[PDB]
Amino acid sequence: MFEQRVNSDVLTVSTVNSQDQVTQKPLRDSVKQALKNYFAQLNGQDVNDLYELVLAEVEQPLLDMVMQYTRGNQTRAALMMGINRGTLRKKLKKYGMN
Amino acid sequence: SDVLTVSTVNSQDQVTQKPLRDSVKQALKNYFAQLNGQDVNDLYELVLAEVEQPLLDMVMQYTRGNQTRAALMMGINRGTLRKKLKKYGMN
DNA sequence: AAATTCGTTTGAATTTTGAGCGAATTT
């Protein structure tokens, strides 16, 4: 009765395929494509912040949406994100979303 | 100005970049829509796992398996990296 | 009014980090 939903098909993105059909592909693939395009435009420059770089780019929308979802309620937001309320307040401050 | 972007196509077959954060936002809007007041519980680990794996995979490819250079690129500790690789069983 | 949330401290648990080391590997 319940079809298996793989973890990679939980957060998905609309894409267009070779037959102009709209399909959901994992968010993973978005991250992969972003990184591949990032690496290609390096041309051998040295990197030292890739994790923080990727992390900000992902934390900001996550907080944005979860704050919209809870209608500004930091306690619920912290509770559905699975992090301490203080950690959440910290992150929100970090991205000027307070 | 945006270092992390993905490729989009519009109805006129024009390709265009968009910030990765738009993808993340879309995926989440879809997630929240699909569940109807069901409880979300560990959304941060959820998203974080969805992002750490392709990151590790791409940086390990770029450095041809060299964990030390990977860790240096990412700006994390080599131990932290080994740990994360263990976590997603890619070692 | 009642409850919930906010805003903040405080100290404990957990995690990340650096540094050091011989073994194994790459150059």
Added chain:
DNA sequence: AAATTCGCTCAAAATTCAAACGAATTT
């Protein structure tokens, strides 16, 4: 032959955390 990396430890620096609690909001 050398240099680099790995695999692994120790402990200390940093971060996350669960509690508080009154003030401030919301229900």
